[PDB]
Scaffold this active site. Structure first.
Site, short mmCIF file in Angstrom:
data_model
loop_
_atom_site.label_atom_id
_atom_site.label_comp_id
_atom_site.label_asym_id
_atom_site.label_seq_id
_atom_site.Cartn_x
_atom_site.Cartn_y
_atom_site.Cartn_z
N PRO A 122 4.01 0.79 -6.26
CA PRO A 122 4.17 2.20 -6.68
C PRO A 122 2.86 2.90 -7.05
O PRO A 122 2.79 4.13 -6.92
CB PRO A 122 5.11 2.10 -7.89
CG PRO A 122 5.84 0.81 -7.70
CD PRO A 122 4.82 -0.12 -7.09
N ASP B 93 7.64 20.53 6.33
CA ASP B 93 7.31 20.89 7.71
C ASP B 93 7.74 19.84 8.73
O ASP B 93 7.78 20.14 9.93
CB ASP B 93 5.80 21.12 7.83
CG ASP B 93 5.34 22.37 7.11
OD1 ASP B 93 6.21 23.13 6.65
OD2 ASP B 93 4.11 22.56 7.00
N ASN C 44 5.15 0.01 10.53
CA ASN C 44 5.62 0.52 11.82
C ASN C 44 6.97 -0.08 12.23
O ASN C 44 7.24 -0.28 13.42
CB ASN C 44 4.62 0.22 12.93
CG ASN C 44 3.23 0.76 12.65
OD1 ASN C 44 3.06 1.73 11.91
ND2 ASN C 44 2.22 0.14 13.26
N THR D 222 -1.76 25.08 8.26
CA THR D 222 -0.39 25.06 7.78
C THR D 222 0.62 24.92 8.91
O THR D 222 1.81 24.75 8.64
CB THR D 222 -0.05 26.33 6.98
OG1 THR D 222 -0.27 27.49 7.80
CG2 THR D 222 -0.88 26.40 5.70
N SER E 84 -1.16 2.81 10.63
CA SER E 84 -2.58 2.47 10.53
C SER E 84 -3.48 3.66 10.80
O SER E 84 -4.59 3.73 10.26
CB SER E 84 -2.91 1.35 11.51
OG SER E 84 -2.42 0.10 11.08
N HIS F 42 -9.45 -2.16 16.00
CA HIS F 42 -8.58 -1.52 15.01
C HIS F 42 -9.37 -0.98 13.83
O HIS F 42 -9.25 0.20 13.47
CB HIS F 42 -7.53 -2.54 14.56
CG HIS F 42 -6.42 -1.96 13.74
ND1 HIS F 42 -6.38 -2.07 12.36
CD2 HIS F 42 -5.29 -1.30 14.10
CE1 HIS F 42 -5.28 -1.49 11.91
NE2 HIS F 42 -4.60 -1.02 12.95
N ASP G 39 4.40 8.32 -0.31
CA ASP G 39 3.82 9.40 -1.10
C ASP G 39 3.45 10.61 -0.27
O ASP G 39 3.46 11.73 -0.79
CB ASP G 39 2.57 8.89 -1.82
CG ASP G 39 2.91 7.80 -2.83
OD1 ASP G 39 3.64 8.09 -3.80
OD2 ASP G 39 2.52 6.64 -2.58
N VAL H 24 -0.19 2.84 -5.72
CA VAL H 24 -1.12 3.21 -4.67
C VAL H 24 -0.45 4.24 -3.76
O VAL H 24 0.75 4.53 -3.87
CB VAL H 24 -1.61 1.98 -3.87
CG1 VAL H 24 -2.24 0.97 -4.82
CG2 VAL H 24 -0.45 1.36 -3.05
#
Length: 279
Positions: free
Chosen positions: A175, A260, A161, A16, A224, A69, A200, A177
Site C-alpha cells: 500500500p 478519462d 500484466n 488533458t 513495465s 527491458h 494508485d 508505494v
C-alpha cells in the site's frame, strides 16, 4: 519547453486529451533529481542518455543489459527523445537476468541497496525508484518496497500484466508505494493491465517507443512501460519543488486527469498521470 513529434505517451502526460503529438514540459526537466531503474540493467553507452546514465550495482556476472527491458524503461524515465525527465540522473541496478527474470531474494537485496546507496549520491532534488517487475504475492517483497519508500525514495512499481486484481502480486500490492496500471493511446485500460484497489495511477503502457540495447529503439507494451512514465514524472515534479518523495504518488493522483479512461473495473481508480504544465 516543447518536444515536437514525441512518443504518444509523453504527449499524453502533458495533455488533458488523447491524440496530441507534442510533449510540453518545464525546461528544468528533472535536473538535480535521481531515478534508480531496478531492472535488467541500462545500456549507459546509448547516446540518448547523454552520459546521464550509469550502472551502480549488478547481481549477475555482468552489469550489462543483455535484454533491453531495463534500457527501455530507463529511456522512458530520462532519455533525451523518449524520456519524461530529460535531465534526470539515471542509476542502473541489475536485479533481473538477461531473460528478464530474478529471484525475490535478489530483488529485495537490490531495493535495500538503493535505500543505502542513495546516501552515496548527489541528488539534491530527491530520489525515485522505478520497479518494472513483479511476481506473486510476497510479504517480504512488499516490506522491502515499503522500506525503500520509508527511507526517502519515491517508489513506483508495475501493477502487472495478468488482467487480474493486483492484490495478488508483489510489490504491486504494497500500500505505501505507487502502483501503476497501463493505458493505451485511445485512453482505454490496456488489455493486459492488472487493476484493483491497490492501483494508485495509470500511465501510458501500450506501444511505447523508447531506447533499446545496441544503440537502437523499439516499441513494446506493459505495465513495465507505464511505471517509468510515473517515475519520471515524480522526478520532474520533485525538481520543480511541487512535491517530495513521501508525497509524490498522492500529489500525482491529486493532479491526474480524472475519469478519462475506459474499461476501468469498479473499485479501480480512474486517474491518468498528468504534469499540468502551463507555458
Amino acid at each position: 519547453a516543447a518536444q515536437t513529434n514525441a512518443p504518444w505517451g509523453l504527449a499524453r502526460i502533458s495533455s488533458t486529451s488523447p491524440g496530441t503529438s507534442t510533449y510540453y514540459y518545464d525546461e528544468s526537466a528533472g535536473q538535480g533529481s535521481c531515478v534508480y531503474v531496478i531492472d535488467t540493467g541500462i545500456e549507459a553507452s546509448h547516446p540518448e542518455f547523454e552520459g546521464r546514465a550509469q550502472m551502480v550495482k549488478t547481481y549477475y556476472y555482468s552489469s550489462r543489459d543483455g535484454n533491453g527491458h531495463g534500457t527501455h524503461c530507463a529511456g522512458t524515465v530520462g532519455s533525451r527523445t523518449y524520456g519524461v525527465a530529460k535531465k534526470t540522473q539515471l542509476f542502473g541496478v541489475k536485479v533481473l537476468d538477461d531473460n528478464g527474470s530474478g529471484q525475490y531474494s535478489t530483488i529485495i537485496a537490490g531495493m535495500d541497496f538503493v535505500a543505502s546507496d542513495k546516501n552515496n549520491r548527489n541528488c539534491p532534488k530527491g530520489v525515485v525508484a522505478s520497479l518494472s517487475l513483479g511476481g506473486g504475492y510476497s510479504s517480504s517483497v512488499n516490506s522491502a518496497a515499503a522500506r525503500l519508500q520509508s527511507s526517502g525514495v519515491m517508489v513506483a512499481v508495475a501493477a502487472g500484466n495478468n488482467n487480474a486484481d493486483a492484490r495478488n502480486y508483489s510489490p504491486a500490492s504494497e500500500p505505501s508505494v505507487c502502483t501503476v496500471g497501463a493505458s493505451d493511446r485511445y485512453d482505454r485500460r490496456s488489455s493486459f493491465s492488472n487493476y484493483g484497489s491497490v492501483l494508485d495511477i495509470f500511465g501510458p503502457g501500450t506501444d511505447i517507443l523508447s531506447t533499446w540495447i545496441g544503440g537502437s529503439t523499439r516499441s513494446i507494451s506493459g505495465t513495465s512501460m507505464a511505471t517509468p512514465h510515473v517515475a519520471g514524472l515524480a522526478a520532474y515534479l520533485m525538481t520543480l519543488g511541487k512535491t517530495t518523495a513521501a508525497s509524490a504518488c498522492r500529489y500525482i493522483a491529486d493532479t491526474a486527469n480524472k475519469g478519462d479512461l475506459s474499461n476501468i473495473p469498479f473499485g479501480t481508480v480512474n486517474l491518468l498521470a498528468y504534469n499540468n504544465y502551463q507555458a
